[PDB]
Amino acid sequence: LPVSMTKTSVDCTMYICGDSTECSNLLLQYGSFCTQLKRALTGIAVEQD
Amino acid sequence: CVNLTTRTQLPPAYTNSFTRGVYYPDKVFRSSVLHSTQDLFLPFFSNVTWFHDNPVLPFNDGVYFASIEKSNIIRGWIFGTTLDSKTQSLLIVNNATNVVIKVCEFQFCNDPFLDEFRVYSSANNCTFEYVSQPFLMDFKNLREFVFKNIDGYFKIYSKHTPIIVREPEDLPQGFSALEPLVDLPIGINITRFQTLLAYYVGYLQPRTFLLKYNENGTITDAVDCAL
Amino acid sequence: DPLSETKCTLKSFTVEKGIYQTSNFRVQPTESIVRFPNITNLCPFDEVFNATRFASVYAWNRKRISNCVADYSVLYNLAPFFTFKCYGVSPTKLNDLCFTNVYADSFVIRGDEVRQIAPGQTGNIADYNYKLPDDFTGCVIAWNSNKLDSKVSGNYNYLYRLFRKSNLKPFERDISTEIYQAGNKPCNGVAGFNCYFPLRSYSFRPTYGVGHQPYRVVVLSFELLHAPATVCGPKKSTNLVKNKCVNFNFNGLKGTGVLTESNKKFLPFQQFGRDIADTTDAVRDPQTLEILDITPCSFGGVSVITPGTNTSNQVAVLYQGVNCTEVPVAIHADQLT
Amino acid sequence: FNATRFASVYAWNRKRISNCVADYSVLYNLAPFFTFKCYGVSPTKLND
Amino acid sequence: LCFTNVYADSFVIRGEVRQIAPGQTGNIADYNYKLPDDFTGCVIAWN
Amino acid sequence: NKVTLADAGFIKQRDLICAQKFKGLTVLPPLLTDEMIA
Amino acid sequence: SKFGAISSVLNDIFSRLDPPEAEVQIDRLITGRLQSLQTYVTQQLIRAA
Amino acid sequence: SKFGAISSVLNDIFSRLDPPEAEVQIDRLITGRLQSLQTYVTQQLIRAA
Numbered sequence A: 001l002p003v004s005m006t007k008t009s010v011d012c013t014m015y016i017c018g019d020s021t022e023c024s025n026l027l028l029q030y031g032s033f034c035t036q037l038k039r040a041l042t043g044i045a046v047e048q049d
Numbered sequence B: 001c002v003n004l005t006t007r008t009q010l011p012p013a014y015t016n017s018f019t020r021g022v023y024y025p026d027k028v029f030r031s032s033v034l035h036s037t038q039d040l041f042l043p044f045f046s047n048v049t050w051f052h053d054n055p056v057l058p059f060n061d062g063v064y065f066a067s068i069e070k071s072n073i074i075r076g077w078i079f080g081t082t083l084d085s086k087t088q089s090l091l092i093v094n095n096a097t098n099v100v101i102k103v104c105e106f107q108f109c110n111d112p113f114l115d116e117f118r119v120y121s122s123a124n125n126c127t128f129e130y131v132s133q134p135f136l137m138d139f140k141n142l143r144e145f146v147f148k149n150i151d152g153y154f155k156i157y158s159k160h161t162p163i164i165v166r167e168p169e170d171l172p173q174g175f176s177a178l179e180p181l182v183d184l185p186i187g188i189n190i191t192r193f194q195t196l197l198a199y200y201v202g203y204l205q206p207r208t209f210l211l212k213y214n215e216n217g218t219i220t221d222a223v224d225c226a227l
Numbered sequence C: 001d002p003l004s005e006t007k008c009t010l011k012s013f014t015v016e017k018g019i020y021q022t023s024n025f026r027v028q029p030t031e032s033i034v035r036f037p038n039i040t041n042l043c044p045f046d047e048v049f050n051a052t053r054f055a056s057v058y059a060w061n062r063k064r065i066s067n068c069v070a071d072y073s074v075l076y077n078l079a080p081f082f083t084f085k086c087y088g089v090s091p092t093k094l095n096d097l098c099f100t101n102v103y104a105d106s107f108v109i110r111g112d113e114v115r116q117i118a119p120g121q122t123g124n125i126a127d128y129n130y131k132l133p134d135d136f137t138g139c140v141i142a143w144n145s146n147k148l149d150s151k152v153s154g155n156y157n158y159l160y161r162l163f164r165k166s167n168l169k170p171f172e173r174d175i176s177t178e179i180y181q182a183g184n185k186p187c188n189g190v191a192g193f194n195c196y197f198p199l200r201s202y203s204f205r206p207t208y209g210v211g212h213q214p215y216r217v218v219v220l221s222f223e224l225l226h227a228p229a230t231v232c233g234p235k236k237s238t239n240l241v242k243n244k245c246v247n248f249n250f251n252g253l254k255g256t257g258v259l260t261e262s263n264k265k266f267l268p269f270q271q272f273g274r275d276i277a278d279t280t281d282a283v284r285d286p287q288t289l290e291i292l293d294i295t296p297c298s299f300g301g302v303s304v305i306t307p308g309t310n311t312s313n314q315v316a317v318l319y320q321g322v323n324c325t326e327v328p329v330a331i332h333a334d335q336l337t
Numbered sequence D: 001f002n003a004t005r006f007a008s009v010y011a012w013n014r015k016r017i018s019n020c021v022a023d024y025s026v027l028y029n030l031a032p033f034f035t036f037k038c039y040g041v042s043p044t045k046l047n048d
Numbered sequence E: 001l002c003f004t005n006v007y008a009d010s011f012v013i014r015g016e017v018r019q020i021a022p023g024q025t026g027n028i029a030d031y032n033y034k035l036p037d038d039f040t041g042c043v044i045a046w047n
Numbered sequence F: 001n002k003v004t005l006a007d008a009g010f011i012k013q014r015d016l017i018c019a020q021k022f023k024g025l026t027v028l029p030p031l032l033t034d035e036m037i038a
Numbered sequence G, H: 001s002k003f004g005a006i007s008s009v010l011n012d013i014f015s016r017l018d019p020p021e022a023e024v025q026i027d028r029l030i031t032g033r034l035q036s037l038q039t040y041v042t043q044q045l046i047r048a049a
C-alpha cells in the first residue's frame, strides 16, 4: 500500500518569467495566484509527512 | 552536333528503402533527447527507382539520391523546370578540385556525360556562382544525397560510407544520418532533374518522425509515425 | 532581516512557532556582454531605396541582402518615409537584432492601394499581383513619388494585372501575359468579349489628388535567426568573460547565466544547443567560433526557522538545495547587489 | 438592350432595376461589341 | 471627466512632428522635447 | 532495490533528468529518513 | 508552447516588439503558464487526496 | 458560447473578418473550449475519487 508521495516545490518567478527577463514586474499585478499555489504545495508537503 | 549515344531500354526495377533517407532537419544540437519533426522526409519501406541511364524524371516534392560505385562514374546533377532554354536551370558538377554551381538557362545535350562535357555548350546569364570543396570524395563507396527546394533554399544533405555490400538489390540496412553540406539561397522552380555520368531515385513527402539523439548528438534511430 | 520578511510574507506582525518558506535568493549578474560578428561593411541601401527606376507591380524585383551591417537610422532622411508600418517587429528595436535572410522587394503602386500591401488584406494588387503571407514579418515602406515618376503626358511603363484565374500563392511572380479565357469561345489572340488583356496599364499625370499619385514601395521581408546570422545591426562588441554571471547578448539572443566550457561534440553546421525542453542550453561565439554551455545562476529555496515573536526575535536561515561551499558570500558588496 | 425605341441623350430615362438575380451573360448575341471598358468592378467579378 | 494638473507645453516643430511620441526617436525626442512613457494627455496640432 | 527513485530531495552539484531544478521545480526531502522508517 | 504568440521565449519579445504590443503576447504566455501551474497543482491535490 | 468573440461558429469568423483579427477572435474560443474541457476533466476526476 502507498503511504507517502514526493514533495515538489514550484518557483513561480523562474517558471513563468524565466529569470533572464524583466517580466516579474508584470507578474505582480496578477493578484495572489502564486501565494495560494505555494501555500497549497506547502500544505501538501506537510500532509505527506 | 551533339554526342548522342543510343542506350537500351531496360525498364527499371524497384527495391526497398529500409532505414535510409533521414537527415538533420535543423541546426540545433540535441543530446539524449527524443524529438518529433514534421519535416519532409523519405517514407520507410518505400519504392525507389533502381537504375543501371539518364531519363527525364520529375522532382515535385524533393528527391532522395543514392549511389554505389567503386570509381567516380556518377558525377553531376542537373535541375530545372523545363530544360528548353526558357527557364533557369541549376547545375552541379564534380571536377577533380572544385564544384561549379551556376544558375543559367542552359542548352545542352539530351544524354550528356562529363569525361565530351556536352553539359555547358551554351550559357547566357549567370545568376549565381559558387565554388567550394568537392561534394564527392577524391561494390564500395556508398554516396547518399537528399535534395529539396523549399522557402527559397536548395539544401544538400550527404554522407559517405565505405560499405561492403553484395551484388543484388540489397541497399543496406542500419542507420546513417545524412549531415548537411550547403544551402544556396536560390529562388528557382525545379520540377524535373537529370543525372550525369547504378543509382537510386527517391521521393520525399511530409511525414511525422520520432528522432533519437545519442549522448554525442548523432542520430542513431528514427521512427516514422505513418508506416 | 528574515524575521520581518517572514512577517511580510505572512502579512502579520506576530509569526508563530514553525518553519516558513519565504522568497528565494538569486545570484545577480555584474557585467553585460554583447558579442556581434566581425563584419563592418555597410548594407547596399543606396542601390535599393535611392534607385532611378523601379519595376512594375506584376514583375517586382527581389534584392538579396547577406553579410552586411544594416543601419536602419540612415533610411529616415534619404526618403521622407511617410509610412513605416512594421509587422511583428517594432521599428525602434530593429537596430539591435541580427537577421538571417533579408529579401528586399521593389514596386510602385497607386496611392489608394497602400492598405492592400499587408498580411491578410485582399484587393486587386494583393490578390492577383503580390500576396503577403499571414505570418509575414518585416516592414512595408512606401513614399509618394509624384515628382520622380509622374510625367505630364503620363508614365506608361507601370502596369497591373486585373484578370487572373485564381489567387496567387505567397511570394510568387507572374510575368506570363496571355489572353485570359472567361467565355465560351477560345480567344486565340482576339481581344473581344470575355477575352481581355491581363496587364492593364496605369496613368500617372500630376493633376490627380493625393490618393491616385504613384507611391514607390520597398518591402523588406525579414527572416529571424534559426541559422547563422548574416545581417546584423550597429552594436559594438564586448570581450567575453567566462566563469561568471553576466548578461549575454549573442546575435540578439539575450539572457542571464554563467558561460563556461561546454565539452560537447558539436558538428560544424550546428550553432545553437538545447536541453530536454526547448530552451537554449549551448551557444556558439560568432567571433571565437567556440561552443559554450549556458548554465543558470546559483539559487535555491530560503526557509526561515523561527520560535515565534512571543518568545524571541532571532531566526535561522535554511538555504534549500545549496551546498555549504556554495552559500552566497557576496553580501559584502550589496550596493552593487 | 433589345428594345425598339430609345431615348435621346437630353431626355435620357432612368429606370430603377432591382429585386432579381442579375445575369450579365445575355450580352453576347449582338453586334461585335466595340466597347466594354469598365471603370469599377471587373467583368469577371460581376456574377458574384 | 475631470483632471488635477493640466500642463501646456508650447513649441513649434516643422515636418518630424511624430517624433514627440513616447518611443519615437529623432533629434527632438532625446534633444529637444521628451514625452513620458505614461503620457495621459492630448497632442493637438495646427497649420 | 525494486523502486527506482527519481530525485529523493538531495542536493544537486551529460545532463540528467534533474534539469527541472533550473526551471524552478525543486523536490523536498522527507522528514523521516529510511533509517528511521526501518 | 506559444499560446498564440510569436515566440515561446520571453527574451526575444521585448527586444523584438515595443513596450505596448509586447504586453499583448507576454500576457498570452503568462495566462497559459499560470493555467498549466493551476492544472498541475489541482492534479497534485487530487493525487495527494 | 462565443466567450466574448463575434460568434460561436468557426468558419463564420473566417468569412466575416480577415487574418490579422481572425486569430484574435478565434483564440478566445479555443482557450475557452480548452478551459471547459479542463473543468470537465477536473470534475470527472473528483467524481472518480
Ligand SMILES: *[C@@H]1O[C@H](CO)[C@@H](O[C@@H]2O[C@H](CO)[C@@H](O)[C@H](O)[C@H]2NC(C)=O)[C@H](O)[C@H]1NC(C)=O
Binding pocket: C038, C286, C287, C288, C289
Ligand atoms: C573574426 O575575427 C577573428 C580575429 O582575427 C578571427 O580569428 C580568430 O582570432 C582569435 C584570436 O586571435 C582566435 O582565438 C580564434 O580562434 C580565431 N578564429 C578562427 C576561426 O580561427 C576569426 O577567424 C574571424 N572570423 C570568424 C568567423 O570568427
Ligand SMILES: *[C@@H]1O[C@H](CO)[C@@H](O)[C@H](O)[C@H]1NC(C)=O
Binding pocket: B014, B045, B046, B047
Ligand atoms: C514496390 O514495387 C513492386 C513492383 O514494382 C511491388 O511488388 C511492391 O509491392 C512495391 N512496394 C510497396 C511497398 O508498395
Ligand SMILES: *[C@@H]1O[C@H](CO)[C@@H](O)[C@H](O)[C@H]1NC(C)=O
Binding pocket: B214, B215, B216, B218
Ligand atoms: C560517442 O562518444 C563516445 C566517446 O568518445 C564514443 O565512445 C562512442 O563510440 C560515440 N558513439 C557514436 C555513436 O559515435
Ligand SMILES: *[C@@H]1O[C@H](CO)[C@@H](O)[C@H](O)[C@H]1NC(C)=O
Binding pocket: C323, C324, C325, F011, F012
Ligand atoms: C557538497 O560539498 C562537499 C565539499 O566538497 C562535497 O564533498 C559534497 O560531495 C557536496 N555535495 C553534497 C551533496 O554534500
